[PDB]
Amino acid sequence: EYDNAIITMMNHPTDAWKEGQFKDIITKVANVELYYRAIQFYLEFKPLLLNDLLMVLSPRLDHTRAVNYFSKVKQLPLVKPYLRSVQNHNNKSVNESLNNLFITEEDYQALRTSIDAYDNFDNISLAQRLEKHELIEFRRIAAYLFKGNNRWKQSVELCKKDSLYKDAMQYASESKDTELAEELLQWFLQEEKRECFGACLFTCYDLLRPDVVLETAWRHNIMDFAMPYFIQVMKEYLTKVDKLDASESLRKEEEQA
Amino acid sequence: TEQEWREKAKKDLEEWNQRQSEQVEKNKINNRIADKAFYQQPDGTEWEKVAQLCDFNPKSSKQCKDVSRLRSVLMSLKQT
């Protein structure tokens, strides 16, 4: 009667069809395309009553063709709860679908959290979209996925493009690598955003040698936000020579024995 | 009645699309005013500017080279 049930449900779209009755015999149905026929016939007549089948058709499901056909009908925003159900799997298809949901959604926060939780995608196209997505935050995440893609110097370079309002510094921080900040920071000095250049240099201070700093300070005859960095230089150097004198004393005293 | 059911499916689709477009417009104008905020900014009064244009961040993440003087400059010179 199970086959008879699916027949008498589907056979008569004119007078004999029913949405709910199908949720029980599914347990012993071997194929999966039968549930696809069910959900398709439902979309044809009652697309609002899909959520039930979605809740019930959870364990046994070929979600690939499911989301494919959902994109076909373009009821992806309607199958959205099913998407929340299955996105925990971090699959290429479900991830890209949610990413398009965020793109057309113009959402970034939840998009951020999603691309953090799930990663089954590339960075290139995502950067392309976010960089042109009208928000400094969108292109900011486009840049974030560069280190997400492990290719720096383009992200903070984009901060150099547009997000200069301390956001250039915001990614100068994460840049965390040498032999760039010298010339980048000098170019930064070309324009008079140097006003906070003490921070602009400190945000990546780890591996700076103050000699070029003194040089360029001389080149513009510039001392502000450097006089502070000069105090830095000498005080680190102060501490350095101090610990050196200490260690030396220890060594010369222990040499006797 | 397959025809009326298809009609109601199209009706639900249109009722969904109109609210989609409405919410896109809503978040769009939200991003517009947020960008205006992103467009309302410059790029003692010198300290007022080292705070206003690009303010540093005196966090607990100074593990680089034990830079302390930032403790003082925030009150001695910078933003003073």
Numbering used by the authors:
A (entry chain K): 1370 to 1626
B (entry chain N): 124 to 166, 189 to 225
From the paper:
We determined the structure of clathrin above AP2 in both the YxxΦ and YxxΦ/[ED]xxxL[LI] cargo–containing liposomes by subtomogram averaging: The structures were the same and thus were combined for further analysis. The CLC region that contacts CHC is well resolved, as are most of the leg and the helical hub of CHC. The resolution is lower toward the NTDs of CHC that extend downward toward the membrane, reflecting mobility of these domains, but is sufficient to position the full NTD. Our structures are generally consistent with those previously described from purified clathrin in solution in the absence of membranes, but by now resolving the NTDs, we were able to derive the positions of peptide-binding sites within the clathrin cage. Between the clathrin NTDs and the undersides of the triskelia, we observed a “bean-shaped” density that is not part of clathrin. β2 appendages link CHC repeat 1 in one clathrin molecule, CHC repeat 2 in a second clathrin molecule (both in the ankle region), and the NTD of a third clathrin molecule. This positions the β2 appendage such that its C-terminal platform subdomain is freely accessible to the Fxx[FL]xxxR helical motifs on the unstructured portions of secondary adaptors such as autosomal recessive hypercholesterolemia (ARH) protein, arrestins, and epsins rather than being blocked as speculated. Another motif-binding site, recognized by regulatory/accessory proteins including Eps15, is located on the β2 appendage sandwich domain close to the point of interaction with CHC repeat 2. We now see that auxilin would occupy a cavity bounded by the β2 appendage, an NTD, and clathrin ankles.
Clathrin-mediated endocytosis (CME) is a vital multistep process in all eukaryotes in which plasma membrane cargo proteins are first concentrated into a patch by clathrin adaptors, which are themselves clustered by interaction with a polymeric clathrin scaffold. The most abundant clathrin adaptor is the 300-kDa heterotetrameric adaptor protein 2 (AP2) complex, consisting of α, β2, μ2, and σ2 subunits. AP2 plays a central role in CME through binding plasma membrane phosphatidylinositol 4,5-bisphosphate [PtdIns(4,5)P2], the two most common cargo motifs (YxxΦ and [ED]xxxL[LI]), clathrin, and other regulatory/accessory proteins [reviewed in (1)]. Here, we used cryo–electron microscopy, tomography, and subtomogram averaging to determine structures, interactions, and arrangements of clathrin and AP2 at the key steps of coat assembly, from AP2 in solution to membrane-assembled clathrin-coated vesicles (CCVs).
